[PDB]
């Protein structure tokens, strides 16, 4: 019977080698990317057929991001592939406030992006998964301010205008869409030119992320 | 102009369906006596998967079967002594679908990717390679069958269904008529003509060598989910989102009758026949499976083995054993 | 073993000063897995202690028996 | 506009049958095949292969 | 200085006191462990390091837990049971007791290179949980139940039988006796303790309400462990000093630290039944996993 053994040892074979490819994929970090108004992929993929894989290194750490604005279907039929995710990336353009949607007139670019904020973060599926925020077109930003009040979206502020507090209060519009504030975190990232800080900061939410859940594994809470 | 006579003819369709309605099956059904309840025992466990588990498909020999997860590991197992044949791993990760030719030579794999993978198993060095990638669509694959060792039909997410030729990597025909995505396609027993179900509620009966529709059947609220024929060839059973499951009829274009519970709320994943066409399986949302009665719409057994959402059915050539795979990442047969 | 519920000899150090006129009442303990303990009451106090047996006048007694 | 039109009519001139009749198949085939089915009738230990 | 006195006093009070409460430590004890193995018996999915250190601290518990009925028959009336089951007994006592405390270093080594060391520190994590562990909590264990093997004999006093350890000229009992100090809580407690303060070190300042509730929880840890084990080993050390000869006082003192000892080591033996309430019914995931096993 060298047949059954054959088999047996063929079984143990690649039943080792997927224990071995199961464990050296664990140790590695996988992002999601998204983005409202223009896909939210220009920045991030410079700085660093149906969806776009994009592997990087900083510190020995090795980061995949998934980018997924080619799939043009319905958002709830896919999903839930993406379920146990590190963290999600959204990329916000913070010079919007005063276009207006290309399809329509009547709906504001950053109600469009705040509601599908509002739709990601509040998802069934992505409950424990933290969310990346990136603030892009700073110096864009900085010199619409002032020939442009803030005021045609967010009629009910009352500030100076002033770069400072708008983005303060932007980033708090933002932040207070979560509804599950114990159980997921937000952070916020103004995005600078120099690309150096960018990476840094995604590396300290990543890390932050990967304490958290060593928090819960180890059963110490 | 044109909406008009199309509801005109919508019109006369229905009229005619009412008219040819004459009885339903239950009432002439009663007569029979129901069958037992089915208590059925699991007999093997295959362990081996790290994530999510998408989709499975028995062979012809009712033996080997293979499996895809997220992992990126498109399993062959052997169901018999539990050993594992192959282990083949995938440029992509995120597949939604899966295949096994009837003679045994080729394995299908698609997903987000919009590329159809077919995998050559037997070949001269003993390993597996790829043997071809089939591109074109501009969606996310949803099903993949094959007819035989030359074509293989596919059901994409851009509301259109494709027969390809292997040897050419080049699409034969394109089936469009759809609404929304297509999520569900079976081959009939002589692999002539094959049925689709969509998003927007309706089964479409199709024709391979004419490539045009023939007929439309509705009545559902929601999302079709999975679909599969009669052993006979002559009616097909459907299942959607809404908790419920229906039972087509071919000849007569018209619903025979429908599965239903008050304490079903959750939808169904895949639905399956038995070898003589009288257990309907169906793999339900919360963790459990149903074995209804295809004469009677009465429960007859539960197979509750699974620790999460069951994602994927089949049941064997000979009706021999039934295969459930969750995303638990575990298959379990049941006898 | 327990610390608590262990086993303890009661007589231990014994000394080797006591005189022999201050021997009022002669008793010898029977306890094994320890050294030989005798019990003998002194007149001073009347109280007991336990020595050791090379003394001249203990091995008198222990030859006298 | 006009494809839908087009396919609707040459969809509608198709043959039917009375529902009665193929139920009365469906369970004549139904009962046909009761004989050959491990799952209604359990195999003996001797011949199941699980 | 030199009047003998009698233990007749503390048998009086150590056979009443001591079978209740090994009883109820019995009970309690046994079915928190069957409830956890059970639990860990029933999870088909991959274990983690820490399923694992839990498996072999329930073992631990288990192998504790089985003795005490011995010791009880032992304090309540005499011994029966002869000279095998008695070196067994002893043999099975040592190992479990340093078994369930080095156990617990090696779980705080863990969980501070998980947390400190998140990012770099995954294959160390499971070397120190594969092969480590064995010539970690284990063989200084069975090399350290040599002298038990060697000497430890069942000896009539008075009408009843002693299973009782007997040593040669009353020195080997001063030196196992600052062994039983050194290994019970030096070799575990230093590892143990900065370990614990300095991930707490490390969790204080965030605002997170997960990390609030993990520095809650490694603060009660801390506490009920030293609460535990320091008393019992005060009372051991006062006790090797007055035998010693260090301090001189009367028989009366002895008996105080008898005492002492008998109460603090009765109230000591709970460590078997607080630990699966505090390394295994205070987690989500075991919480979760449980109750998947139960239905
Ligand atoms: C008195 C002693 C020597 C009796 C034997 C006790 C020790 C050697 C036994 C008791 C329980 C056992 C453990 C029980 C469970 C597991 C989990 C498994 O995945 C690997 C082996 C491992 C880790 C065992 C190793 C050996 C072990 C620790």
Redesign the pocket.
């Known amino acids: 019977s060298a047949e059954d053994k054959a088999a047996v040892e063929r079984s143990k074979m690649i039943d080792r080698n997927l224990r071995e490819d199961g464990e050296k994929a664990a140790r590695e970090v996988k992002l999601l990317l998204l983005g409202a108004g223009e896909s939210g992929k220009c920045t991030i993929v410079k700085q660093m057929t149906g969806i776009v894989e994009t592997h990087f290194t900083f510190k020995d750490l090795h980061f995949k991001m998934f980018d997924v604005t080619a799939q043009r279907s319905e958002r709830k039929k896919w999903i839930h592939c993406f379920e146990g995710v590190t963290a999600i990336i959204f990329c916000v353009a913070l010079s919007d406030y005063d276009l207006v949607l290309a399809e329509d007139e009547e709906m504001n670019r950053m109600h469009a992006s705040m509601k599908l904020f509002d739709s990601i973060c509040n998802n069934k599926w992505f409950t424990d998964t933290s969310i990346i925020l990136f603030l892009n077109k700073k110096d864009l930003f900085e010199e619409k301010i002032k020939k442009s009040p803030l005021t045609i979206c967010y009629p009910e502020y009352a500030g100076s205008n002033t770069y400072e507090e708008a983005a303060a209060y932007i980033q708090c519009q933002f932040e207070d869409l979560n509804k599950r504030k114990d159980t997921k975190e937000i952070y916020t990232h103004f995005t600078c030119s120099t690309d150096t800080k960018n990476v840094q900061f995604v590396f300290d939410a990543v890390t932050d992320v990967i304490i958290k859940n060593n928090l819960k594994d180890c059963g110490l809470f | 102009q044109l909406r008009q006579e199309a509801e005109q003819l919508k019109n006369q369709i229905r009229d005619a369906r009412k008219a040819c309605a004459d009885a339903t099956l239950s009432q002439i059904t009663n007569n029979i006596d129901p069958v037992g309840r089915i208590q059925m025992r699991t007999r093997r466990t295959l362990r081996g998967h790290l994530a999510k588990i998408y989709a499975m498909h028995w062979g012809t020999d009712s033996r080997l079967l293979v499996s895809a997860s997220q992992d990126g590991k498109l399993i062959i197992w052997d169901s018999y002594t539990t050993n594992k044949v192959h282990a083949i791993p995938l440029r992509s990760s995120w597949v939604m679908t899966c295949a096994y030719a009837p003679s045994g030579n080729y394995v299908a794999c698609g997903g987000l990717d919009n590329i159809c993978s077919i995998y050559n198993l037997k070949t001269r060095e003993g390993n597996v390679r790829v043997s071809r990638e089939l591109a074109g669509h501009t969606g996310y694959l949803s099903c993949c069958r094959f007819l035989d060792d030359n074509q293989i039909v596919t059901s994409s997410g851009d509301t259109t269904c494709a027969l390809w030729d292997i040897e050419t990597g080049q699409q034969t025909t394109t089936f469009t008529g759809h609404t929304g995505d297509v999520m569900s396609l079976s081959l009939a027993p002589d692999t002539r003509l094959f049925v689709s179900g969509a998003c927007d509620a309706s089964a479409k009966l199709w024709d391979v060598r004419e490539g045009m529709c023939r007929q439309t059947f509705t009545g559902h609220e929601s999302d079709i989910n999975a679909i599969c024929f009669f052993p006979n060839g002559n009616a097909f059973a459907t299942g959607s989102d809404d908790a419920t499951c229906r039972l087509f009829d071919l000849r007569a274009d018209q619903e025979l009758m429908t599965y239903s519970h008050d304490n079903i709320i959750c939808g169904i994943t895949s639905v399956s026949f038995s070898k003589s066409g009288r257990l309907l399986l169906a793999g339900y949302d919360d963790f459990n499976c149903n074995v209804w009665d295809a004469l009677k719409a009465d429960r007859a057994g539960v197979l509750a083995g699974h620790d999460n959402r069951v994602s994927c059915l089949g049941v064997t050539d000979d009706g021999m054993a039934v295969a459930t795979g969750s995303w638990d990442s575990f298959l379990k047969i049941w006898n | 073993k327990p610390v608590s519920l262990s086993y303890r000899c009661p007589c231990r150090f014994f000394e080797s000063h006591v005189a022999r006129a201050n021997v009022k009442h002669l008793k010898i303990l029977n306890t094994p897995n320890c050294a030989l303990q005798i019990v003998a009451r002194l007149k001073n106090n009347n109280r007991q202690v336990c020595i050791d047996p090379k003394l001249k006048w203990i091995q008198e007694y222990l030859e006298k028996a | 506009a006009r494809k839908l039109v087009e396919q609707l009519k040459m969809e509608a001139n198709i043959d039917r049958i009375k529902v009665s009749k193929a139920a009365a198949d469906l369970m004549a085939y139904c009962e046909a095949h009761a004989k050959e089915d491990p799952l209604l009738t359990p195999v003996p230990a001797s011949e199941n292969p699980f | 200085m030199k009047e003998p006195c009698f233990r007749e006093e503390n048998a009086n009070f150590n056979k009443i006191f001591l079978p209740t409460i090994y009883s109820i430590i019995f009970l309690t004890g046994i079915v928190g462990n069957g409830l956890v193995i059970l639990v860990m018996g029933y999870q088909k999915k991959l274990?983690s390091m820490t399923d694992?250190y839990r498996?072999?601290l329930s073992?631990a518990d288990l192998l504790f837990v089985i003795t005490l009925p011995f010791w009880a028959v032992d304090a309540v009336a005499n011994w029966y049971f002869g000279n095998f089951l008695c070196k067994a007994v002893h043999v099975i006592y040592t190992?479990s007791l340093y078994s369930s405390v080095l156990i617990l270093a090696f779980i705080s080594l863990d969980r501070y290179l998980a947390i400190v060391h998140a990012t770099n520190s995954q294959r160390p994590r499971k070397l120190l949980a594969e092969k480590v562990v064995y010539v970690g909590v284990?063989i200084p264990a069975?090399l350290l139940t040599i002298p038990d093997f060697i000497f430890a004999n069942v000896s009539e006093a008075d009408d009843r039988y002693i299973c009782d350890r007997f040593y040669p000229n009353d020195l080997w009992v001063v030196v196992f006796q600052f062994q039983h100090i050194m290994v019970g809580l030096i070799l575990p407690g230093i590892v143990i303790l900065s370990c614990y303060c300095i991930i707490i070190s490390k969790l204080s300042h965030s605002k997170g309400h997960q990390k609030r509730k993990a520095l809650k929880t490694t603060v009660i840890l801390i506490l009920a462990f030293f609460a535990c084990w320091l008393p019992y080993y005060i009372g051991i050390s006062i006790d090797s000093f007055i035998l010693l000869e260090i301090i001189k006082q009367g028989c009366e003192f002895e008996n105080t630290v008898h005492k002492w000892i008998s109460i603090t080591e009765a109230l000591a033996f709970f460590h078997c039944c607080l630990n699966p309430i505090l390394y295994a019914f205070l987690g989500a995931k075991f919480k979760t996993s449980a109750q998947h096993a139960l239905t």
């Open positions: 274990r694992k498996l072999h073992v190992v284990w069975l």
